[PDB]
Design a protein around this nucleic acid. Structure first.
Lengths: 146, 389, 328, 329, 323
DNA sequence: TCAAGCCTTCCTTCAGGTGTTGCTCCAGAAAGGGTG
DNA sequence: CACCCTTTCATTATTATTATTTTTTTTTTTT
């Protein structure tokens, strides 16, 4: 963390005034004569997400040139939000020795090797591969805590 | 007329100076005493001097803020200087008359700043019509350049940041290209950085002058060759001269209003040739742009001992007083003052190593702010973090 | 491709922030308890990294407009200025859930998770409006990445990047504008001013005793209703400030970029604020750079005629069945 | 609709600013502790980014009237000159909460969190008056955008549009004006004068005894007395100002109502200091969406707006203000 | 209602400027330190916006009688001249707080933090006097707007232009007037003049000894100082505006304007500085002044004549009472 | 052509602001009903 | 059955909040 972990707020609401003028103009076909800020299309929603400005360091085994070619397009990281967050100032890949690198700090299967399981790993439901947001692919995994 | 209308490839040597050259070009200055001696060989210019007197900052960065009698006096100056008969007036006098009228016509428009300075010889009347904004002309050079390489010895701020550099030369950001610099180890290898310093803070005081001069006496006693002691002002170097005169005798060289950098440099070669060990109370051009590597031994730099000691007496803050730097400082703030001081100090430290192969080089910093707990001298420490022991 | 819009706000900028912020009458933000305080809604500010000062990174406040406000403003000006006249010159009637998907980022077309084939993903991402944002139950990634409105400020030099050092601000950029509401019954002068009130003098007097009783009861409780007499504060970003706006499009078509350009052609009538009553957030556009090349002129956009022809033939051909098929 | 009215203030302009602000006798504003410091209410300052010198965009103070004050003045001008005069011409009357919503937007604190109806929002935003200022217990967006009144000044070039570079002032626009509260009974020059004051001489001498006790208490310390010596910063008169009154998708009648207000802006005070005639103005021009439609008699142009507002105020009734005014909860 | 009175000051006008000004022997105002400078207060000054080069507008100082000064002057010249005779002849007798609120507009510097009931505000805005000035502890807004007295100048042309181009005057309007307080024990120089002294010649000589000791914080009677006046004879206008006046209130202001002649613009009393003669009164653009007084406008005088009759102090007592 | 100003005054007490002034709302969605 | 109204239920509880302290040089080789 270069910065303290602050918070971002965002809200969502459809503009009711333009909806009313479109309902009169005929461009909107709305049978309901009243909105609802607690639910529905005109719901106002407030939501707060943590915000961190940080140096992000990962460890992996692979070809540096391909990672550079992939990360050249990487304009954002953490959220591909399309709203402006996580813009990459830069990236850097260096080779390091074997005993320094903690590859093991990763979501692992429960049948992993005894030298690969650490203390901060614990048994849970997590994705270990591919789309980590897809809960249908989530498996019984041993994973580290951020 | 003298250069092609479109430059396909432009390479600038020592690009750090180049903007100042533009700042040299777009100042048109009216010199009063050569005019007054030329006309004798009007009373309106004397009234311009009398109204010029009423206006330590004398009207800095003010294009037209105060003009009580400045513009009718300028108009009378223009009309009494341009209507003098060209027939019978001398061939070298018309140069003075024409540069004075060009400077006055630059002054009249109101698109330029006005500055006052006096000569080092005496309190002569010097007046300047200069341009503090320089985006238009240099941008008119960059659309006229296809590609350019700007090479310098202090071009970059910190690592790969050169943002203020493309601010000074007004380089377009789309055409800017920031390459990694080359900072070899042999520039920092033979140089030895000493822990001792002057405990008094530099505050233009005589007690600081005595304690600092006792440290110069220590360094000159331990010097196996020449010593350059760098200052930023005339007053502190005259304080150091008055504190080191009877102490050092013929070993010292001072720079003043009557002692230029070239004369001092020539004396430095002269009494290094005589075998004595000189010290040099240097300022101004002694910071940036002097060759203190000897040309009597080209092939063998391991016997180079012309300058065995560089001592920096104070951090060079407040050195750049130009119109463009004042305007750029007013936008940026304290940061531009700190980074320009870093570039001046890097040019000051670059006088030690000019070629690889030299040995037994000594570097001294006596500013007590450097070794203090202040955070504003933080870059000044990291450059001193490139030396060890 | 990238569009950078440099604008100056004619009026102040106010985008309200969460939390309970209190200011004294002098100006001290967030006082310790035991002293009189004041309600304050500051403009939205993020703590950003700063290499100014030292080489180490320090956390500095930076007062912005959030990027969501930018995204919705760009969206709403495309709907209000080019999309709606095209759809009402044809006679199209949107549905709620398709109107909610086009005008908001909401999934009330079907709250259910609608499956999206890759061919229909491709045919909706190539739509001149729809593929910019997406939204709805498909939850497909829109092509438009709209950044926050960043002021050209020294706290944002990491966000702004090099090149904005000329024409740059520093120091404080927020002013705490104090506003108030007076009870207008106290403003009532005479019988001619009060004759429009049902009851008139009796009703005005009754409200005055009601307000007096409520205020003295509240002050006696200090040693749950509320009156009209209010006096509060809100931090705004200073007017006349220069702002950069980054709009990066992930593999766009010509019609999508043309729609963004025609949004910038007509966004002078739009506002960016939580101050719509006070005309806050009025701005004029000073520069629009496409792929690093500036294109904005004083008489709208001059350049990118291929984008203009593409967006003309795009907004001519739409018949709003694609909006309905995008919703459900 | 983007109305641009350029005004000329005949008298000074005083929109006071909150805060514990002090001034010395010679004029040192906000002086440090340990010196003689005096109360001062500064006028409304807006920090504006400006081009001081060459480049150097910096936050310099301009002196304004806020958009709330100017907007309220517009609200009061069309109300007290067009709306309620033509509304008491027949038997239409409002409730006192409807008066409160017509003058301050809302009728109470703690407004209800329920939304307003779509057809209700639509018919109020098409109203000649209610659509310009939509408050109420259910928040409604006002069609009227009213910008702060800016002096035509060189600190506001990044605020002001083109074509106003001429007739345009520069330099400081304020003056500190000093008002001293003078106890009136020390001006009493005879017992002829004291007859009307109670008790004859005894109550006047009792107030002198009272003043002496308060003076001794304040001096030995170093209620409250009647001496009220103070100074207030004003914006100097004769200035030309710009005022921008925008209307997003306006009805013809609403623009006609703002036009009739601008035609009846005479003898109105802008900001504050009502006792000292502060805020009297003579509007030099109105710019209706780029066109100049002011002569010194009045508007005398754009007959569609005046006809629209005329047929609007003939059909004006109070029931729109009531259905704007009742709380849903 | 618009009231545009046209006065020409017969005497120099001096309205004291707060601060600490200084002047040399000559007209150099606020000298740099080192030269012997004399204390000086100036005429109260207001910057205008005016065109210096006939196209360029600049803040230029103009010397004025302030609006609050003329507001207090109007309060004094209606209160003593018509309000006090109506109170005296009916035997109506105010209180001390009522008198303070009748002049200062506030009985006490502390106001009560309450609003008044509307029937009260309507009654006192119906008042010919209290409706004009308002005030009180509950802050009644008055019906009278009193502007500063403006000399018809180049500077005031952007202030005033309703037919004031020809008789507009150009040039500076100020003058420095000096005053020395001499110790008059240094001027008697006689035994006939010292017989009035209790103690006599020895007492006078002892005062000279104290003057000898103090001349090289007991400050003696010596003083040399100056004050800046407006010149006499130039012609000014005054804006008096009424927001929603009753006919009684405007009749009271008209009756003030009819007896405005023997009153001093508040200023330097002993030098007779405030003297002026009304050249005209424009009444919504209608000139209704004559050399005898105010011709025409009889309904306003009739309304204030009925207004003055039946005047009672019970409203002045109610207005001054706090919570 | 000489005279071509000498001295001394350099402001004194006042003059402290008072009231109000603390935000308001909400950012739920499954429950039955009712209507085309 | 898609379009809405309007009902209904829920258990603990507290409140902290980043903002700054230059020196005054005379270079350079243009028209």
């Amino acid at each position: 963390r270069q910065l303290p972990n602050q918070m971002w707020m965002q809200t969502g609401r459809l503009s009711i005034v333009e909806a009313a003028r479109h309902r009169q103009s005929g461009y909107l076909q709305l049978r309901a004569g009243k909105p609802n800020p607690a639910g529905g299309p005109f719901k106002t929603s407030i939501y707060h997400r943590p915000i961190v400005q940080a140096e992000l360091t990962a460890f992996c085994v692979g070809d540096q040139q391909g990672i550079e070619a992939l990360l050249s397009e990487c304009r954002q990281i953490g959220g591909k939000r399309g709203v402006g967050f996580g813009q990459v100032a830069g990236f850097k890949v260096e080779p390091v020795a074997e005993t320094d690198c903690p590859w093991s700090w990763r979501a692992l299967p429960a049948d992993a090797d005894p030298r690969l399981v650490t203390s901060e790993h614990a048994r849970c439901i997590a994705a270990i591969r591919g789309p980590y947001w897809d809960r249908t692919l989530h498996v019984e995994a041993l994973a580290p805590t951020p | 007329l003298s250069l092609p209308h479109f430059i396909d490839t432009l390479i600038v040597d020592e690009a750090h100076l180049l903007e100042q050259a533009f700042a040299s070009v777009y100042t048109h200055t009216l010199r009063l005493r050569p005019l007054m001696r030329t006309i004798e060989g009007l009373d309106a210019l004397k009234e311009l001097f009398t109204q010029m007197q009423v206006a330590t900052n004398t009207s800095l960065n003010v294009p037209l803020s105060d003009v009580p009698e400045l513009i009718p006096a300028l108009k009378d100056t223009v009309k009494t200087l341009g209507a003098l008969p060209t027939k019978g007036m001398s061939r070298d006098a018309r140069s003075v008359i024409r540069i004075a009228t060009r400077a006055a016509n630059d002054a009249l428009s109101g698109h330029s700043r006005l500055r006052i300075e006096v000569t080092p010889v005496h309190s002569y009347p010097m007046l300047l019509s200069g341009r503090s904004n320089l985006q238009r002309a240099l941008l008119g050079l960059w659309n006229a350049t296809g590609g350019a390489t700007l090479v310098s010895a202090t071009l970059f701020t910190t690592g790969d940041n050169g943002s203020l550099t493309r601010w000074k030369l007004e380089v377009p950001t789309e055409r800017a290209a920031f390459l990694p610099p080359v900072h070899p180890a042999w520039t920092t290898a033979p140089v030895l950085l000493h822990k001792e310093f002057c405990a008094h803070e530099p505050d233009d005081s005589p007690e600081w002058a005595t304690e600092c001069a006792q440290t110069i006496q220590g360094v000159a006693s331990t010097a196996q060759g020449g010593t350059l002691v760098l200052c930023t002002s005339y007053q502190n170097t005259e304080l150091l001269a008055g504190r080191l005169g009877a102490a050092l005798g013929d070993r010292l060289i001072v720079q003043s209003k009557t002692s230029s950098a070239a004369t001092c440099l020539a004396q430095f070669k002269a009494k290094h040739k005589a075998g004595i060990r000189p010290v040099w109370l240097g300022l101004g051009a002694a910071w940036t742009g002097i060759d203190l590597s000897d040309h009597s031994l080209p092939d063998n730099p391991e016997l180079d001992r012309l300058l065995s000691d560089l001592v920096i007496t104070r951090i060079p803050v407040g050195q750049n007083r130009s119109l463009t730097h004042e305007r750029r400082t007013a936008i940026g703030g304290f940061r531009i003052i700190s980074q320009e001081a870093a570039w001046h100090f890097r040019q000051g430290l670059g006088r030690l190593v000019r070629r690889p192969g030299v040995t037994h080089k000594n570097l001294w910093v006596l500013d007590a702010r450097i070794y203090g707990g202040a955070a504003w001298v933080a870059p000044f420490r990291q450059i001193l973090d490139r030396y060890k022991k | 491709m990238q569009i950078e819009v440099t604008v100056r706000n004619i009026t102040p900028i106010f985008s309200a922030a969460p939390g309970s912020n209190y200011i004294t009458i002098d100006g001290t933000i967030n006082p310790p308890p035991g002293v009189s305080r004041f309600p304050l809604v500051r403009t939205r500010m993020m703590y950003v990294a700063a290499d100014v000062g030292d080489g180490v990174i320090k956390s500095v406040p930076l007062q912005i407009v959030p990027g969501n406000t930018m995204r919705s403003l760009l969206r709403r000006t495309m709907l209000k200025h080019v999309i709606e006249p095209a759809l009402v010159e044809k006679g199209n009637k949107l549905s709620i859930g398709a109107y909610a998907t086009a005008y908001s980022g909401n999934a009330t077309g079907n709250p259910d998770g609608v499956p999206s084939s890759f061919d229909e993903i491709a045919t909706m991402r190539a739509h001149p409006f729809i593929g910019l944002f997406g939204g709805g139950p498909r939850m497909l990634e829109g092509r438009l990445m709209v950044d926050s409105l960043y002021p050209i400020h020294t706290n944002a030099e990491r966000i702004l990047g090099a090149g904005y050092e000329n024409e740059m601000m520093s120091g404080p950029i927020t002013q705490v504008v104090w506003a108030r509401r007076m009870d207008p019954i106290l403003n009532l002068g005479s019988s001619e001013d009060v004759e429009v009130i049902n009851g008139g003098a009796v009703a005005a007097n009754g409200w005055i005793q009601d307000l007096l009783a409520n205020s003295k009861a509240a002050a006696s409780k200090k040693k749950n209703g509320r009156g009209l007499k209010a006096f509060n504060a809100h931090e705004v970003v200073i007017p006349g400030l220069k702002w950069v706006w980054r709009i990066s499009l992930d593999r766009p078509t010509d019609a999508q970029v043309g729609l963004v350009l025609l949004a910038l052609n007509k966004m002078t009538n739009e506002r960016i604020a939580g101050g719509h009553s006070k005309d806050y957030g009025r701005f004029v556009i000073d520069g629009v750079s496409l792929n690093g090349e500036q294109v904005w002129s004083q008489s709208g956009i001059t350049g990118g005629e291929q984008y203009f022809d593409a967006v003309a033939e795009a907004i001519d051909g739409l018949s709003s069945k694609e909006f309905e098929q995008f919703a459900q």
